Amino acid sequence: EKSVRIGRQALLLAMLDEGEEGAILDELRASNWRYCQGRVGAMEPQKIVAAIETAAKRHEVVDGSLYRDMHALYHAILEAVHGVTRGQVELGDLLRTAGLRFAVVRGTPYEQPKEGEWIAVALYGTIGAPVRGLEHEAVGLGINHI
Amino acid sequence: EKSVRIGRQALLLAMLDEGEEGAILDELRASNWRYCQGRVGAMEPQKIVAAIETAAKRHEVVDGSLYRDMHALYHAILEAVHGVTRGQVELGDLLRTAGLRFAVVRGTPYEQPKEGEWIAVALYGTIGAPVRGLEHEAVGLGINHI
Amino acid sequence: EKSVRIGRQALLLAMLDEGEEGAILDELRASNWRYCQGRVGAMEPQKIVAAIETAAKRHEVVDGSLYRDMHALYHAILEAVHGVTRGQVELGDLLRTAGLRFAVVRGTPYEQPKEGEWIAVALYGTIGAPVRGLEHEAVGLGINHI
Amino acid sequence: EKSVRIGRQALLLAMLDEGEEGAILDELRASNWRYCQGRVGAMEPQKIVAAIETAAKRHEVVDGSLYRDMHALYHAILEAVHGVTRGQVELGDLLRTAGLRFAVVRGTPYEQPKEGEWIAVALYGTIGAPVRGLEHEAVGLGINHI
Amino acid sequence: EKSVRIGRQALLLAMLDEGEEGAILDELRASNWRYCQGRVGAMEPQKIVAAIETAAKRHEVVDGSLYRDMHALYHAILEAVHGVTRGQVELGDLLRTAGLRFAVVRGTPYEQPKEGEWIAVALYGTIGAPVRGLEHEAVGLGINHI
Amino acid sequence: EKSVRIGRQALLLAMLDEGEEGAILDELRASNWRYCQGRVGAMEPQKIVAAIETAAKRHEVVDGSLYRDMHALYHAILEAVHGVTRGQVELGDLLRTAGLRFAVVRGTPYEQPKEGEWIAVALYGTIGAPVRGLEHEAVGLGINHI
Ligand SMILES: N[C@@H](Cc1c[nH]c[nH+]1)C(=O)O
Ligand SMILES: N[C@@H](Cc1c[nH]c[nH+]1)C(=O)O
Ligand SMILES: N[C@@H](Cc1c[nH]c[nH+]1)C(=O)O
Ligand SMILES: N[C@@H](Cc1c[nH]c[nH+]1)C(=O)O
Ligand SMILES: N[C@@H](Cc1c[nH]c[nH+]1)C(=O)O
Ligand SMILES: N[C@@H](Cc1c[nH]c[nH+]1)C(=O)O
Ligand SMILES: [Mg+2]
Ligand SMILES: [Mg+2]
Ligand SMILES: [Mg+2]
Ligand SMILES: [Mg+2]
Ligand SMILES: [Mg+2]
Ligand SMILES: [Mg+2]
Ligand SMILES: [Mg+2]
Ligand SMILES: [Mg+2]
Ligand SMILES: [Mg+2]
Ligand SMILES: [Mg+2]
């Protein structure tokens, strides 16, 4: 009964370049956890939330018709987005835009089997002015029971 | 095209297990950037801030007597801590505690040399109740010009 | 010189089903306090604020032309809406919508007659995804002197 | 149609005077849901959180050794406390104190059985200066899946 | 047209050097408004709030035994303090300290007499690390009806 | 090596009537600091941010093409706007609008020449309902190294 850093897995999927994330994809392949990865460019924060919801449903990480799944996920997304905005969640209303990669991981990270499933949402990318090149990095992670 | 993800380097230092970080430590040597790593266990947020300020100074990443350096670092730390707390920056006052790794990296990551120096502060850890095992992961990143 | 739970009156008007709130309507009828009740469905928070302002003016709880009345009320509304959003006041920008009942009560709740008038704004309903059934409950209360 | 307003039950327990709550206590018996009530006087927010965690555990509403239960409850408590503080969760640090009743209710309130269990935490009280009589009402509600 | 910028008067009292404020002190005499000034050094925010409450009472700007007066003043103080902290109201808990001047002015600044009395609270100072010289300026203003 | 209250200079430019700010304009003329003044009426906060950015670039206080300058300024603007909104930065989404004067000052306020440049953003005006006359005053100040 080993414990796993599910959040760090999600983050690595969001921040490692393609073909560097091989070992993560294999760990998740082994323990048979559901996950998805995606990208979103946004000036409205709801577009982030919807992108992640669209991806998680699409790759069967969560069931769009089951509120407990969607409630779990929604709260994780909002925690992740707070990491990126480092305060109030605003993009366009504060004249900034973000370009982000995301990952979502659903699994059983705890040693005790009774801890059940947990979900992780990671974000990594840039935030900046609406003009290319006037930006820096940002990150977030959200965790919730599911 | 010559730009570097300084934040991702800092986050990788904070999150990769000791002994997995060699290629990040090598890149930093080649560019001759200053950096440091550390760990802090805290039930009060000022202990995080003091720990990272203490580390950065003692490793000569910043000059503790120069306000522009300490001003730049302080704001980057608060940004990183927001990512960890996902809302109001509180630990003990909301009955939670954190165990965090951190890293600080300063160099010049943009192509244009006029962009000068920037500093990244990354936190990766757990947060939870003050009871062993009742915790989950958290992450944060702050960036500032310096 | 009895004291009255004006906030709890407002809340009961917002959360009790119709025909259950009889005794509240009679207490308010007795002490001759002004009040109003209403409903709003919204994806933009300003639509909540405007609905409540429209109702309070309409039922003569406040004077639309007197800023001290409208300043009193506005601040109470925003406190109530914070209860509902449990953090940043966002609906649509965070991909959620709310369906709420409200009540506003204006009166003299304190024992001392010199405490003058006070106003209460209560909200109760659901918040959720923009899709019906994927929602749970929410509440708020705001109090201010007037 | 079979759904229940679990939050409204919790709020009614918290706010109705002792002896007025019988029909709420009866509904809860018929559905066989777990629940508890309590009171806390506090000048620090962690005392609220500790009080409700202590109560829920000691009445077997949650399992203090199971993180998914304590994780679900903790987030519901912070949501309820936001409603009380109407902004930053502070008491003593902003020179205020609170006297609150609380209730926690867990059962399954949705029609579809797959929605499983949810927990409500409700706070109703006063908040004010640390001087007798310089206070007004406050309320909060938090809901989470569990 | 007869309106007065009561907040600007309060801010000018707080920020102008002693001996530069005479014309503001004169305007206040002519209108016979109540007011007070003061200084507070603090590492905890409640010390600000207590200091301004203490000053207002002891100079008879407000009646410490009347809740409507203390309620009006308290909210104006928290607003002013938000301007100083530029986010979460924290000093010591985020490893910073402040040295502030304040002023409180109450009179009736609107044209229409029905608008009655209003109170302004202004803070002007520095905030910084608890080390001499590692600081910069900050300001705040709060207004409320009273 | 004298120290200068650069923030208080910016604030005075934002709050003093025209022809009253003479001595400030002369001090800045003497030390040869860059600055600009402006006005903005807005119901969307990004319109404030853009107005100030447009003015600062236009009067050569900052270089629009240099991210370190624009990053410095952006953060100062957001600190200033927090002073005005006294919490969450919202105007129209919370059914309020603002009419503001601003000033931006860039200079070398510290005694030590190694402290380099710093920038100040001040705001002063009114915030209120979208209807004229139902408003009161607001202020903010942001400081950052540059
Ligand atoms: N630096 C901002 C983003 C930005 C807006 N404009 C320029 N940069 C941030 O930390 O989010
Ligand atoms: N889950 C909390 C931490 C915690 C407090 N108590 C139990 N857990 C968080 O997300 O920060
Ligand atoms: N559960 C969210 C609302 C929601 C959005 N999407 C799904 N649910 C809240 O607490 O406000
Ligand atoms: N009125 C404050 C409580 C308070 C503090 N001091 C006086 N009253 C609030 O709304 O939370
Ligand atoms: N610069 C901080 C104050 C500070 C803390 N440590 C150093 N400086 C602020 O803007 O509030
Ligand atoms: N009084 C509000 C502004 C307002 C909105 N509506 C009426 N007034 C504030 O402090 O920001
Ligand atoms: Mg929810
Ligand atoms: Mg600063
Ligand atoms: Mg605090
Ligand atoms: Mg504290
Ligand atoms: Mg106001
Ligand atoms: Mg918004
Ligand atoms: Mg918006
Ligand atoms: Mg959690
Ligand atoms: Mg109050
Ligand atoms: Mg930035």
mmCIF file of C-alpha atoms in Angstrom, chain F residues 21-131:
data_model
loop_
_atom_site.group_PDB
_atom_site.id
_atom_site.type_symbol
_atom_site.label_atom_id
_atom_site.label_comp_id
_atom_site.label_asym_id
_atom_site.label_seq_id
_atom_site.Cartn_x
_atom_site.Cartn_y
_atom_site.Cartn_z
ATOM 1 C CA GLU F 21 -0.441 71.342 -7.654
ATOM 2 C CA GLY F 22 2.143 73.912 -8.768
ATOM 3 C CA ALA F 23 4.808 73.128 -6.170
ATOM 4 C CA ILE F 24 4.602 69.409 -6.896
ATOM 5 C CA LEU F 25 5.096 69.987 -10.618
ATOM 6 C CA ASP F 26 8.171 72.091 -9.720
ATOM 7 C CA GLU F 27 9.732 69.534 -7.428
ATOM 8 C CA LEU F 28 9.403 66.967 -10.167
ATOM 9 C CA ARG F 29 10.736 69.476 -12.653
ATOM 10 C CA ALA F 30 13.774 69.958 -10.370
ATOM 11 C CA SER F 31 14.704 66.314 -9.745
ATOM 12 C CA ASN F 32 13.915 65.643 -13.404
ATOM 13 C CA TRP F 33 11.517 62.648 -12.733
ATOM 14 C CA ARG F 34 9.061 61.449 -15.330
ATOM 15 C CA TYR F 35 5.367 61.628 -14.645
ATOM 16 C CA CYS F 36 1.915 61.897 -16.132
ATOM 17 C CA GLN F 37 -1.606 62.732 -14.988
ATOM 18 C CA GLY F 38 -4.880 61.639 -16.437
ATOM 19 C CA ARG F 39 -8.534 61.005 -15.884
ATOM 20 C CA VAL F 40 -10.736 57.968 -16.532
ATOM 21 C CA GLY F 41 -14.460 57.210 -16.151
ATOM 22 C CA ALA F 42 -15.088 53.510 -16.123
ATOM 23 C CA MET F 43 -17.492 50.672 -15.512
ATOM 24 C CA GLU F 44 -14.919 48.064 -16.408
ATOM 25 C CA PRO F 45 -11.739 47.841 -14.484
ATOM 26 C CA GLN F 46 -9.568 47.034 -17.489
ATOM 27 C CA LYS F 47 -10.420 50.487 -18.848
ATOM 28 C CA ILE F 48 -8.602 51.914 -15.856
ATOM 29 C CA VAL F 49 -5.607 49.757 -16.374
ATOM 30 C CA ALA F 50 -5.486 50.628 -20.145
ATOM 31 C CA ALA F 51 -5.896 54.363 -19.530
ATOM 32 C CA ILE F 52 -2.991 54.482 -17.194
ATOM 33 C CA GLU F 53 -0.841 52.277 -19.460
ATOM 34 C CA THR F 54 -1.779 54.581 -22.438
ATOM 35 C CA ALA F 55 -0.857 57.676 -20.465
ATOM 36 C CA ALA F 56 2.381 56.328 -19.014
ATOM 37 C CA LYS F 57 3.650 55.218 -22.461
ATOM 38 C CA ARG F 58 2.477 58.417 -24.096
ATOM 39 C CA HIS F 59 4.378 60.725 -21.612
ATOM 40 C CA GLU F 60 7.414 58.531 -21.709
ATOM 41 C CA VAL F 61 7.181 57.325 -18.120
ATOM 42 C CA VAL F 62 7.551 53.750 -19.259
ATOM 43 C CA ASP F 63 8.607 51.904 -22.485
ATOM 44 C CA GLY F 64 5.688 49.945 -23.881
ATOM 45 C CA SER F 65 8.076 47.486 -25.529
ATOM 46 C CA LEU F 66 10.039 46.603 -22.446
ATOM 47 C CA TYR F 67 8.289 44.005 -20.327
ATOM 48 C CA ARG F 68 10.138 44.797 -17.061
ATOM 49 C CA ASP F 69 8.724 48.352 -17.271
ATOM 50 C CA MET F 70 5.265 47.209 -18.097
ATOM 51 C CA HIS F 71 5.332 44.439 -15.444
ATOM 52 C CA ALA F 72 6.394 47.026 -12.848
ATOM 53 C CA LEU F 73 3.716 49.371 -13.823
ATOM 54 C CA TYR F 74 0.922 46.790 -14.178
ATOM 55 C CA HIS F 75 1.426 45.574 -10.552
ATOM 56 C CA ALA F 76 1.425 49.122 -9.276
ATOM 57 C CA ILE F 77 -1.773 49.857 -11.101
ATOM 58 C CA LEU F 78 -3.512 46.812 -9.646
ATOM 59 C CA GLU F 79 -2.398 47.838 -6.052
ATOM 60 C CA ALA F 80 -3.822 51.280 -6.662
ATOM 61 C CA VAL F 81 -7.104 49.937 -7.978
ATOM 62 C CA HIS F 82 -7.454 47.675 -4.841
ATOM 63 C CA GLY F 83 -7.411 50.871 -2.735
ATOM 64 C CA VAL F 84 -10.280 52.224 -4.753
ATOM 65 C CA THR F 85 -12.397 49.101 -4.665
ATOM 66 C CA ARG F 86 -11.562 48.218 -1.054
ATOM 67 C CA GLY F 87 -11.781 44.529 -1.801
ATOM 68 C CA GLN F 88 -12.495 42.696 -4.970
ATOM 69 C CA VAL F 89 -11.746 44.725 -8.007
ATOM 70 C CA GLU F 90 -15.117 45.103 -9.625
ATOM 71 C CA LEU F 91 -17.099 47.965 -11.017
ATOM 72 C CA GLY F 92 -19.872 47.044 -13.399
ATOM 73 C CA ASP F 93 -20.129 43.453 -12.300
ATOM 74 C CA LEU F 94 -21.022 44.804 -8.836
ATOM 75 C CA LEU F 95 -23.237 47.613 -10.294
ATOM 76 C CA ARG F 96 -20.875 50.493 -9.573
ATOM 77 C CA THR F 97 -18.768 52.842 -11.741
ATOM 78 C CA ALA F 98 -15.836 55.059 -10.950
ATOM 79 C CA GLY F 99 -14.601 58.456 -11.996
ATOM 80 C CA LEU F 100 -10.967 58.868 -11.285
ATOM 81 C CA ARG F 101 -7.968 61.031 -11.683
ATOM 82 C CA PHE F 102 -4.616 59.369 -11.796
ATOM 83 C CA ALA F 103 -0.982 60.193 -11.639
ATOM 84 C CA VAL F 104 2.109 58.149 -12.250
ATOM 85 C CA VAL F 105 5.563 59.139 -10.989
ATOM 86 C CA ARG F 106 8.827 57.472 -11.759
ATOM 87 C CA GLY F 107 11.906 58.369 -9.826
ATOM 88 C CA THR F 108 14.689 57.704 -7.401
ATOM 89 C CA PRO F 109 13.133 58.319 -3.979
ATOM 90 C CA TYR F 110 15.586 56.581 -1.660
ATOM 91 C CA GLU F 111 18.728 58.108 -0.089
ATOM 92 C CA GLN F 112 20.912 55.256 -1.345
ATOM 93 C CA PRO F 113 21.543 55.631 -5.089
ATOM 94 C CA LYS F 114 21.713 51.784 -5.393
ATOM 95 C CA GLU F 115 17.867 51.634 -4.702
ATOM 96 C CA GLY F 116 17.398 52.747 -8.229
ATOM 97 C CA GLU F 117 14.082 53.653 -9.715
ATOM 98 C CA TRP F 118 10.562 53.199 -8.294
ATOM 99 C CA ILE F 119 7.242 53.931 -9.681
ATOM 100 C CA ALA F 120 4.051 55.242 -8.102
ATOM 101 C CA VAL F 121 0.516 55.046 -9.267
ATOM 102 C CA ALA F 122 -2.157 57.099 -7.481
ATOM 103 C CA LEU F 123 -5.848 57.206 -7.979
ATOM 104 C CA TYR F 124 -8.413 59.572 -6.490
ATOM 105 C CA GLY F 125 -12.027 60.194 -7.243
ATOM 106 C CA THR F 126 -15.462 58.898 -6.822
ATOM 107 C CA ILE F 127 -17.153 55.508 -6.888
ATOM 108 C CA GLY F 128 -20.789 55.038 -6.880
ATOM 109 C CA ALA F 129 -23.912 53.927 -8.415
ATOM 110 C CA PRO F 130 -24.263 54.269 -12.139
ATOM 111 C CA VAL F 131 -26.363 57.363 -11.482
#
